[PDB]
Amino acid sequence: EAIIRIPPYHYIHVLDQNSNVSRVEVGPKTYIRQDNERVLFAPVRMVTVPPRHYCIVANPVSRDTQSSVLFDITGQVRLRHADQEIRLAQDPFPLYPGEVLEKDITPLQVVLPNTALHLKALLDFEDKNGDKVMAGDEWLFEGPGTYIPQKEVEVVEIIQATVIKQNQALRLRARKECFDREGKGRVTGEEWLVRSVGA
């Protein structure tokens, strides 16, 4: 049929045979497809992002400084393809053709006050405070709070802060040429203790 029924908060993708490109048709419109227009799939609910959650969709539409969806000269949505987009929280928005949903309504991580996060970067990127982070740079994020899951930063594991009770010390061991809290040269294979009561 040439008649389509789009509810107020649903979207579809139409591949125009003549216009030779695809585009998004956000509702609410019970739009009628032209003879050239062909609908791909049935109406699907908008990509909703409740608060206190997050999602990331690959191949984001590359928007300019005005955050407008730039359509290509041919007519297809201009995607970044390789890159990704960090979606924190907003109203239910339409997916554009060529966008692959990777994460969807996944809960925002919650770091406990007595734990941290182990982080891999994967290539170089500029940090929040203008810090150049290598592809193999190691970052630690202690809470409490809520870190934002980035496309340039990956979470490895959960660090459990070992508690040291009174008249105790913690045997450590360094896996690289690093510096501990006491600022002493910590070569690989060296061991040392902690001299402060507390987590």
Give the Cα separation of 57 and 52 in Å (integer): 17
**Shortest distance, position 109 Cβ to its own copies, whole Å:** 10
Binder of its own copies out of 91, 157, 183, 184 (CB under 8 A): 91
Encoded one letter per residue, x for contact with its own copies by CB under 8 A and - for no contact, window 107-146 reads -x-xxxxx-------xx----------xxxx-----xxxx
Residue 175 found at the interface with its own copies (CB under 8 A): yes
Q: Provide the strand spans (E) within the chain.
A: 10-11, 13-15, 22-24, 44-45, 47-49, 53-58, 84-87, 90-93, 100-101, 106-107, 115-121, 125-126, 132-133, 138-142, 153-160, 172-173, 178-179, 185-186, 191-192
The residue type found at 58 is A
**Shortest distance, position 94 Cβ to its own copies, whole Å:** 13
Place of tokens 């007519």: 75
Residue 106 found at the interface with its own copies (CB under 8 A): no
Encoded one letter per residue, x for contact with its own copies by CB under 8 A and - for no contact, window 69-88 reads -----xxx----xxx-----
**Shortest distance, position 114 Cβ to its own copies, whole Å:** 6
Binder of its own copies out of 32, 34, 44, 92 (CB under 8 A): 92
